[PDB]
Point group: C4
Amino acid sequence: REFNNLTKGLCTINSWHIYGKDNAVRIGEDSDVLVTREPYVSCDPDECRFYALSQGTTIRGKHSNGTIHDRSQYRDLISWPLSSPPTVYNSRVECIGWSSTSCHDGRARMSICISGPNNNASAVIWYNRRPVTEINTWARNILRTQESECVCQNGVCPVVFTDGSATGPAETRIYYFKEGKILKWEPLTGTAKHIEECSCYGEQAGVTCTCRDNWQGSNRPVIQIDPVAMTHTSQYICSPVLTDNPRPNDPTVGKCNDPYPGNNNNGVKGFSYLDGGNTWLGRTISVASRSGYEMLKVPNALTDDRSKPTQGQTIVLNTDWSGYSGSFMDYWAEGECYRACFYVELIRGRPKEDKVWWTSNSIVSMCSSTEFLGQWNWPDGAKIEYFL
Amino acid sequence: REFNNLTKGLCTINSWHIYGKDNAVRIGEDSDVLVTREPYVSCDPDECRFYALSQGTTIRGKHSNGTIHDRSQYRDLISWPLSSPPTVYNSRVECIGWSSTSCHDGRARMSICISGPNNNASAVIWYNRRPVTEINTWARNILRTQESECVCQNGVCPVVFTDGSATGPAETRIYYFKEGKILKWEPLTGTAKHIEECSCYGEQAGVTCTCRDNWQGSNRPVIQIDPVAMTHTSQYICSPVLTDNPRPNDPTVGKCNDPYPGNNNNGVKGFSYLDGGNTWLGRTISVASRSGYEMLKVPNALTDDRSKPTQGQTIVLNTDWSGYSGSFMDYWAEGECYRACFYVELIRGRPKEDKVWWTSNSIVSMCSSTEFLGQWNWPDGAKIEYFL
Amino acid sequence: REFNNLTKGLCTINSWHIYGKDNAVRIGEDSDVLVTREPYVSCDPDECRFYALSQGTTIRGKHSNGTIHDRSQYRDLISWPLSSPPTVYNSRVECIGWSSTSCHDGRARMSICISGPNNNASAVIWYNRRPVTEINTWARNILRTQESECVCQNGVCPVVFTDGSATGPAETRIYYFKEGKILKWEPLTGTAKHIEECSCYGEQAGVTCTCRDNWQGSNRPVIQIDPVAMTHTSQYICSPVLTDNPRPNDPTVGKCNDPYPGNNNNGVKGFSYLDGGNTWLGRTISVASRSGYEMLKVPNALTDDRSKPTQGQTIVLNTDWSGYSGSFMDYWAEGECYRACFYVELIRGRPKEDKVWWTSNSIVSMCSSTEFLGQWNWPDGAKIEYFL
Amino acid sequence: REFNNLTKGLCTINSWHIYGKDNAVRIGEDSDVLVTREPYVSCDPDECRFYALSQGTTIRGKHSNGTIHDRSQYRDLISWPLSSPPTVYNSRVECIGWSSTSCHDGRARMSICISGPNNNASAVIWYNRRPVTEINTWARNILRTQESECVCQNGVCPVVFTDGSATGPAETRIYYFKEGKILKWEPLTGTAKHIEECSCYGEQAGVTCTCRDNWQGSNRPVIQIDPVAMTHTSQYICSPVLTDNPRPNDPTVGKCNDPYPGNNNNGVKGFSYLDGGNTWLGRTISVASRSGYEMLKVPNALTDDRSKPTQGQTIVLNTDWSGYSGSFMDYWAEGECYRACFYVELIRGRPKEDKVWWTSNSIVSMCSSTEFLGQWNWPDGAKIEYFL
Ligand SMILES: *[C@@H]1O[C@H](CO)[C@@H](O[C@@H]2O[C@H](CO)[C@@H](O[C@@H]3O[C@H](CO[C@H]4O[C@H](CO[C@H]5O[C@H](CO)[C@@H](O)[C@H](O)[C@@H]5O[C@H]5O[C@H](CO)[C@@H](O)[C@H](O)[C@@H]5O)[C@@H](O)[C@H](O[C@H]5O[C@H](CO)[C@@H](O)[C@H](O)[C@@H]5O)[C@@H]4O)[C@@H](O)[C@H](O[C@H]4O[C@H](CO)[C@@H](O)[C@H](O)[C@@H]4O[C@H]4O[C@H](CO)[C@@H](O)[C@H](O)[C@@H]4O[C@H]4O[C@H](CO)[C@@H](O)[C@H](O)[C@@H]4O)[C@@H]3O)[C@H](O)[C@H]2NC(C)=O)[C@H](O)[C@H]1NC(C)=O
Ligand SMILES: *[C@@H]1O[C@H](CO)[C@@H](O[C@@H]2O[C@H](CO)[C@@H](O[C@@H]3O[C@H](CO[C@H]4O[C@H](CO[C@H]5O[C@H](CO)[C@@H](O)[C@H](O)[C@@H]5O)[C@@H](O)[C@H](O[C@H]5O[C@H](CO)[C@@H](O)[C@H](O)[C@@H]5O)[C@@H]4O)[C@@H](O)[C@H](O[C@H]4O[C@H](CO)[C@@H](O)[C@H](O)[C@@H]4O[C@H]4O[C@H](CO)[C@@H](O)[C@H](O)[C@@H]4O[C@H]4O[C@H](CO)[C@@H](O)[C@H](O)[C@@H]4O)[C@@H]3O)[C@H](O)[C@H]2NC(C)=O)[C@H](O)[C@H]1NC(C)=O
Ligand SMILES: *[C@@H]1O[C@H](CO)[C@@H](O[C@@H]2O[C@H](CO)[C@@H](O[C@@H]3O[C@H](CO[C@H]4O[C@H](CO[C@H]5O[C@H](CO)[C@@H](O)[C@H](O)[C@@H]5O)[C@@H](O)[C@H](O[C@H]5O[C@H](CO)[C@@H](O)[C@H](O)[C@@H]5O)[C@@H]4O)[C@@H](O)[C@H](O[C@H]4O[C@H](CO)[C@@H](O)[C@H](O)[C@@H]4O[C@H]4O[C@H](CO)[C@@H](O)[C@H](O)[C@@H]4O[C@H]4O[C@H](CO)[C@@H](O)[C@H](O)[C@@H]4O)[C@@H]3O)[C@H](O)[C@H]2NC(C)=O)[C@H](O)[C@H]1NC(C)=O
Ligand SMILES: *[C@@H]1O[C@H](CO)[C@@H](O[C@@H]2O[C@H](CO)[C@@H](O[C@@H]3O[C@H](CO[C@H]4O[C@H](CO[C@H]5O[C@H](CO)[C@@H](O)[C@H](O)[C@@H]5O)[C@@H](O)[C@H](O[C@H]5O[C@H](CO)[C@@H](O)[C@H](O)[C@@H]5O)[C@@H]4O)[C@@H](O)[C@H](O[C@H]4O[C@H](CO)[C@@H](O)[C@H](O)[C@@H]4O[C@H]4O[C@H](CO)[C@@H](O)[C@H](O)[C@@H]4O[C@H]4O[C@H](CO)[C@@H](O)[C@H](O)[C@@H]4O)[C@@H]3O)[C@H](O)[C@H]2NC(C)=O)[C@H](O)[C@H]1NC(C)=O
Ligand SMILES: *[C@@H]1O[C@H](CO)[C@@H](O)[C@H](O)[C@H]1NC(C)=O
Ligand SMILES: *[C@@H]1O[C@H](CO)[C@@H](O)[C@H](O)[C@H]1NC(C)=O
Ligand SMILES: *[C@@H]1O[C@H](CO)[C@@H](O)[C@H](O)[C@H]1NC(C)=O
Ligand SMILES: *[C@@H]1O[C@H](CO)[C@@H](O)[C@H](O)[C@H]1NC(C)=O
Ligand SMILES: [Cl-]
Ligand SMILES: [Cl-]
Ligand SMILES: [Cl-]
Ligand SMILES: [Cl-]
C-alpha cells in the first residue's frame, strides 16, 4: 500500500551466509527445467523470487542446441520461487525479451524487457503486470539494460540502459520511472563513460550502481543516483583490487576517474557494496575466465587508490564455473538496516564445456551476517558427462 | 464487484509491441504440453490468460496422432497463465467441447463450449464456473461460435453463433447473455452474407466483430453491436486490402455490401481494429496459404472502398506458418483509452508439415504502442526434424 | 459461514449436458497421471472438484502392475480441479485408505477414508482437513462406504457404511455426522435386504440414496433419510427397468420390496434421480458387463412396478467401457432448483483389457438441462495398443 | 495473529490411526520426485505439511548416484503438501543446508538450516521466510540440530543443537528463539549430556524432547524444557523397553541416570510420548537394523525401571525398511487436548539395497485415537527391481 523509501543504511558485513541455491542444472538432467542465463533475484513486500532469461526450451530438450546465443524470439524474463529451479510448470513470464530488469516499489512490480533485431530493439515497461510504456532503440545497436534488479524510492525507480555498438557511438541513459511511466531521463555524465550491466542497491535515499566499462575492463565504474532530484554522479572504484573479468593483475595503485589499462572486448557483469570501512567487493577468482567467485573486504575501495583486502570469503572455488553476479536486498525485512545480498550465476555448458550443445546456469545467492561465519564453497554441482 | 462498461475509445496505434509468446511447440518437444488449436487471449480484472481448445493429449503422446481433426469428445476449452505453455499441470478446464468463446464481465467470467455430433450439437453457457444455460442446435449442422473472446458492457455479453452450411447460407444468431442467462437473441441482419469465427473488441459502448465469410468472401464481414439496445448491423470491410486466406490479389476497389469474389468454401479466422483514421487490419502475407502475418494501417478501411496501407508491421515472416488471429483487450488496465491487442495462432504439423502425425500451435500476441517501434518477426521457433 | 440447508427441489430433467471430462488415460499415456479407480465429484461453495482413490503410482510407472487390486496401503482419497486429470503434481490428498466419501456442509468439508486389512479396518473422519473421529470395523469384513459424495443438511451429514460379507455376518449402518463428530447411528431398517456403495442426493430437507444390493443384482435398493429426525426408510425401485450389472433382462413387472431375482454376489455402484414424473435411472447398456451407459426417463420408477421408459439418452456406447456411476449436485449454484448431476467411471485395463498390467479409469460427468439437447457419446478415448 | 501457548495436555492414546503417507519412492519411479532423507511433519495454523532434506536431484536422475552421503552443497530443507510426494514442482525451499528444524509460533514459521564443511558449519535462522540470525560452529565438528519440528510457547521456541565429535564426547546447547532472535542459550546440564536429533512436543506450558545418546546409548535421553523460565532438566527413559537401534535385547531392569550398556556412538533418531500411564514409545522392531516400527504402551516408562508393554501397535513390519522417526502435533486443532502424532522415514536404496546407486525415503505418519482401532502395516511399497 505505501511506496517504499530507502530509509536505512547497510548492516555491518562481517561475513556472508547462504540465502538461496536452485541446483537447476543437476535437477534439470531429469526434469522439465528451462534453459536460462542472466539470472538475478528480487523481492516483493511478501516474497523473494529468482529471475532469469529463459531460452524457450528445456535443457534436455532438443531445442537446447544453440542456447549459447544471447538474443532470440524464444527468450523471456521469467520468475519462480526462491531456491526452486526454473521449471516449465512453475515459472511465471514477466515479459518477452532478451535483456531485462525488474523491481518492486512497495505497491507493485515494474518489469522491463527488451526485444527486437539488433538494429530495431525496443523496451516495454510493464507495471502491475500490464504494459505501460515503450521505448524505441536510440542508437540502433542492441538496446540493453541491467540484467539485475532496479531499486525504487517513493515510487521512483531509476534504470540504466545502454544502446550502441561495442566500439561505436554508444549512449548510456538513466530513466526514471514511476508506475511504469517516464518521469525523466538523462544521458550519462561524470567520469564513467562506456557503461553497462549495472548492479544496484539502495540505502539512505540513494541508489548505488556498480557497472562494467565496455572499453577497458579492470576497475569498475560506479553510478550514484539521487532518486528524489533525479540526478546522478559517476566515478571508478579506486582500489587496486580489480574486479572485472578478464582483468589485469592487481597493481599497488589503482585509478579513481579512469579505467586502469584493461581489455576491450568482453567483461562480466559484477557488483559491490561501497560503504566506507564496511566495503565489500565481489570478483571472479580467475583473472581471465569466469571461474571462481570471492568476496573481499576492501575498506574505502571507492575512494582509496591503495586499498587492499582486510578479510575475505570464498563463494565458488576457482575450479568451478561462475558467471554474472549482481546485488539485491530485501527492502521489506524487519530491523534497523538493510542486509546486503548478492547472487552468482554458475554457467554450465558452452563455450567452456563444449561436449554439450547447450548453455545454461544455476544460481547461488548469499546475504551478509554480523557474525564471522565459517565459509563453504557452492558449486553448480552437475556432471556434464551425465548429459552426454 | 462492478460490471465493466465500455466507456473508453481505442488508443492511437502507431506500432505493435510484443505482449506474450508461449513457445509451446518448442517447449513441448520435451515437456508435458497439451496439443491445442484455436487459441486466444482474455483478461479478468486482475490477470490475463491464454485460452485454446485442448485435444486431450500431449504432443509427444501417441494420442497426438489424428489431431488434425477439429471435433472430438476429447477437446476442451483450457486457460493457462500468460506466456506459459498449455501443460497438463497448469491448464484449467473452462468447459468441454470443440468450439468456444469466453469473457469476463467485471464481476465474473462467462465461458461457452459447444459439443456433440455434427447434426446434434449443443452449447453450454457457464457463468462463475457453473453451467447456467444450454442451447440446442437450430440447423443441425455444426453449431459453432467465435473461437476468441467475447466482450461485455454493463453485464451484457453479445456472442455470435452459426449453425448450418459452411458453403452456403446458414443461420447466424447474435445472443445477448447476462450472468449466463439469455436476455435476447436476433438473427443476423445487414449485408454480411455469411459469418463464422468473429473476432470482437469493445469501445465506446459498442462491440465490433470482424468475421470470416467462408462461403464467398475474401473481404471480411463486420458486425457492429449495441449491447445497450441489444441490436446489431453488419457489412463488409470495403477496403481492397483483402484480409481472408486464401484470397485473390488486392484490387483497386473493394466491396462494402457483398463478398469480394474469387475464392469459395475456405477462409481463416482473422480480425481488425476499425477506428476511422486509427484503423489497422491483420492478414496472412500469403494469398494462398496460412503463412506469414502482417498488420497494415488502412485509414477508414471499413467504409472506404479504395483505402490502401499508409503504414505496416510484419509480425510473422512469410517463410513461417501462421493460422487463426483474433482480438482482445485488457478492459481493466489504467489510463484513458483501451489498448488494442491481438494474437496469432502459429500452426505446426499437419497438413503443411506432414512428416509428423499431429497438428498443434503456439501463440504470439501483441498490443498497440503510441510510439513508432522497431519491428521483429516472431516465429513458432520449433524444428520439426526434432519430432521425427 | 452458514451450514447449507436442502431447501430446493430438483430441476426438471429434459436431457443431460456434458459437465466435465478428464481424458485421464489418454493424457496419462505420456504424462505423470496417477492410477485411480472409484471416482466421484463433489462441490464446495466456491469450487467443484474431481475425487478418486489413487493407487500410489502413475499409469506408465512400473508400479501400475497389479492395480486391478482394490485394497493396498498405497491408496488414498485425492481431489483435483474439475476436468483436469489426476496428476502427481496437482492432486491433493484428503486422507489415506481404499474406501471413501466426502461432502461439504457449507462451512467445511468432511472426508472419510477407510484403511486396514479386511478383518481389522477403520474409518477416519476428517473435518476441515483435520482428523476428528475414528470408527473401528464392527463385522471384521471390509468395512466400506459410498465411493461418492455424501450430502448435508443444517450441518448433519448422513453417511452409509457396510461391514460384513454378502454371505457370513454383515451390517449396514447410517452414521449421522456433524463437524466430523458422531450424532447417532442406525442399523439398516426397511425392505432393502443388503446394501452398499450408496449414491446420494439432497432435496427438500431429505437425502435419497440409490444403492447396490450385492446378494441379488437387478433392481436397486433405495434409502430415504431424514437428516433432521435422523431416521430413514428403505425399499427397492419397483420399475422393471433393471439397473444393476450383471442383471437379468427387463421383465414386464418389477418388485418393490425385494430384489427382482438377479445375478448373485456380483454388482456395480450406480444411481438414480427419483422424483415422480421427473424420474431418471442410469444403467450400463450391457446386461453382462460394465459396458455402455444410458439414462432412461421412467416416470414413477420408485413406486410403479410396470413403469417403462418415456425418454432416454445414451452417454457411453455398448462398445465402450463404463464402470461405477454416482450422483452429485452443486448445492451452492444460483436459482430456484438443484440441477441433477452424475458421473460415470470409464474403466480401462484389467480385467477386460489384460494386455496391460494396470487398471485405471477416466471420468465423464453430466448435469441435467430443461432443454431437449442432442446427444453424443463420451468414451474414455485411449488406445490400449499405445500402452504396449 | 496470536502466539500459541501450550495450554492443553495429550489426548488419551488407545491406538494410532493413519494420518499421512506419500508413497514417494513408488511414484518417483516414473515422475519427477526429489531424492530426500531426514523427513518430518510440521503444522501451521491452517495446514500441515511434510518436510525433508532434498538432495538437489530426482531419484531417476543420474545425480541420484551418490545420495547415500549426508552433507553436500545440493541439500535444502523443503516442505510440500501433506501426503503428496516431494516433487520438483510442488516443493517449497525453506532454507539451504543439510541439518534442520522448523516450527510455527502461531504467528509465523521459524526454519533453521545448517550448512558448511564439517569444521566450519553455521546455522541460519529464518523467520517469516527471511533470514534473521546466524550461528557459527562452536566446536568445529558438524554443527547439527533436531531433524524434526521444534515447539513454541508464547513465541519462545527451544531448539537443541550439537557440535563436536561423537568420540569427544560431543557438546549440546539449547537455544531459545523468539521471532528468529536468540533470547538465551544454555549448555546441556544434567545426567544426559551427549545428545542429538531431539524429537519434541509441547503440552501444559512445557516441551519434552526425546533424543539419541551419541556416546554410549541404548535407552534414550530426555530433556524437559520450560520455555517460560527457559531452563531445562535432563534424564534417561528408565524403562527396560530400549528404543535405540542398534541396541541390546530388552533387560528386566533399565537405567534412569546413565546410558544402558550397548553400542558405541551410532543410533537412530526416535521419539516417545511420556505422559504417565498414557505413555507410548516408538522403536524399530529390529534390534540391529533399521527394520520395522512399532508403538508400545509402557506406563511410566520415564520413571519406572521395570516398565514393560501393556499394549502395542505394529506400524511397519519387521521385514520392511524403516529409519528415523519423530514427533509432531497439530497445536491448532479443535477440542480440549493435543493429539499425539508421529512419522516414520521409510529408507530405500543404499546401504541396504545397493543394486541402486541412490538413497531416498518415503513417509508414513500416524495420529493417536481414543478408540481401540484395528492395526495395519505400512510399507514403503516400491520394488527395487523396477529401478534397475
Ligand atoms: C525498423 O522498424 C521500422 C518500424 O517497423 C521499419 O520501418 C517500417 O518498414 C516497413 C517495411 O518497409 C514499413 O511497412 C510497409 O509499410 C508500407 C506503407 O508505408 C509506405 O507506403 C505508404 C503509402 O504509399 C503510397 O501513398 C503515398 C502517399 O500518397 C505515395 O507517395 C506512395 O508512392 C504510395 O502511392 C502508391 O500507392 C497508393 C495507394 O496507397 C496509390 O494511390 C499510388 O498511386 C501509388 O501506387 C507511404 O505513406 C509510406 O511513406 C511513409 O513512411 C515511409 C517509411 O516506410 C517514409 O519513407 C515516408 O516519408 C512516409 O513517412 C511508405 O512508403 C506498406 O505498403 C508495406 O506493406 C506492403 O508491402 C508488404 C511487402 O513489403 C506486403 O507484405 C504488404 O501486404 C503491402 O503490400 C501489398 O499490399 C499492397 C496494398 O494492396 C499492394 O499495393 C502491394 O503491391 C502488395 O500486394 C501484393 O502482396 C500482398 C501480400 O502478399 C498480396 O495480398 C497482394 O495481392 C499482392 O500480391 C509495409 O507494411 C513500415 O510502415 C515502416 N514503418 C515506419 C514507422 O516507418 C524500419 O524499416 C526498420 N528498420 C530496419 C533497418 O529494418
Ligand atoms: C573457517 O572459516 C573462516 C571464515 O571464512 C576462515 O577464515 C577465513 O580464512 C580466509 C582464507 O584465509 C580469509 O580470507 C583471506 O583474507 C585475506 C585478508 O586477511 C589477511 O590480511 C589482513 C590484512 O593484512 C594487512 O594488514 C596487516 C596488519 O594490518 C599486515 O600484517 C599485513 O601485511 C597487511 O599489510 C590481515 O589483517 C589478516 O589477519 C587477520 O586474520 C587472520 C586470518 O585470516 C588471523 O590469523 C590474523 O591473526 C588476523 O586476525 C589476514 O592476514 C585476503 O587477503 C585473502 O585474499 C587473498 O587471497 C585469496 C586466496 O586465499 C585470493 O583468492 C584473493 O584474491 C586475495 O589474494 C589476491 O589479491 C591480493 C590483493 O591484491 C594479492 O595480494 C594477492 O597476491 C592475490 O592476488 C593474486 O590472485 C588474485 C585472484 O586470482 C588475482 O586477481 C591477482 O592479480 C593475483 O594473481 C582472503 O580473502 C578470511 O578473511 C578468514 N576470515 C576470518 C574471519 O578469519 C577459516 O580459515 C576457516 N577455517 C578453516 C579451518 O578452514
Ligand atoms: C439428436 O438427439 C436427440 C436427443 O437425444 C435424439 O432423440 C432421442 O433419440 C433416442 C434414440 O431413439 C431416444 O431414446 C430412446 O427413448 C425411448 C423412449 O422414447 C420412445 O418411447 C416412448 C414411449 O412409448 C410408449 O408410450 C407411448 C405413449 O406414451 C406409446 O405411444 C408407445 O406406443 C409406447 O407404449 C415414446 O413416447 C417416444 O415417442 C416420442 O419420442 C419420439 C422420439 O424418440 C418421437 O418420434 C415421437 O413422436 C414421440 O414424441 C419414443 O417412441 C427408449 O425406450 C429407448 O430406450 C430403449 O432402447 C434403447 C436402444 O435405443 C436401449 O438402450 C434402452 O435400454 C431401452 O430399451 C431396452 O429397455 C426397454 C425397457 O425394458 C426394453 O423394452 C427394450 O427392449 C430394451 O431392452 C433390452 O435392452 C436392455 C438394455 O441393454 C436390456 O437391459 C434388456 O434386458 C433388453 O435386452 C431410448 O432411450 C430419445 O428419447 C430421443 N430424445 C428425444 C427428445 O427425442 C435424436 O435421435 C438425435 N438425432 C439424430 C438425428 O441422431
Ligand atoms: C486387530 O487389531 C488389533 C488392535 O491393534 C489387534 O490387537 C492387538 O494385537 C497386538 C499383537 O498381539 C497387541 O500388541 C502386543 O501387545 C503386547 C502387550 O500386551 C500383552 O501383554 C500385556 C501385559 O502382559 C504382562 O502383564 C501380564 C499381567 O498384567 C502378565 O500376565 C504377562 O505375563 C506379562 O508379563 C497383557 O495385558 C496383554 O493382554 C491383554 O490384551 C490381549 C490382546 O493383546 C488379550 O488377549 C488379553 O486378554 C488382555 O486383554 C497382552 O497379552 C506387547 O507386549 C506386544 O509387543 C511385544 O511383542 C512384539 C512381538 O509381537 C514385539 O515386536 C514387541 O517389541 C514386544 O515384544 C518384545 O518386547 C518385550 C518387552 O521388552 C519382550 O518381553 C518380548 O519378548 C519382545 O522382545 C524381543 O523383541 C524385541 C523387538 O524385536 C527386542 O527389542 C527384544 O530384545 C527381544 O528380542 C505387542 O505390541 C495389541 O496390543 C493388540 N491391541 C489390542 C487393543 O488388543 C488384533 O490382534 C487384530 N486382530 C487380528 C485378527 O489381527
Ligand atoms: C517517502 O519519502 C518522500 C521524500 O522524497 C516523502 O515525501 C514521502 O512522504 C515518504 N513516503 C512515505 C510517507 O512512506
Ligand atoms: C455502466 O453503464 C450503464 C449504462 O449503459 C449504467 O447504468 C451503469 O450504472 C454503469 N455501471 C457501473 C456501475 O460502472
Ligand atoms: C437451516 O435449516 C434449519 C432448520 O432445519 C435452520 O435453523 C437454519 O438456520 C437454516 N440455515 C440457514 C438459514 O442457512
Ligand atoms: C500465553 O501465556 C503467557 C504465559 O507465559 C501469557 O503471559 C500470555 O498472555 C499468553 N498469550 C495468549 C493469551 O495467547
Ligand atoms: Cl563435470
Ligand atoms: Cl522445421
Ligand atoms: Cl483400444
Ligand atoms: Cl524390493
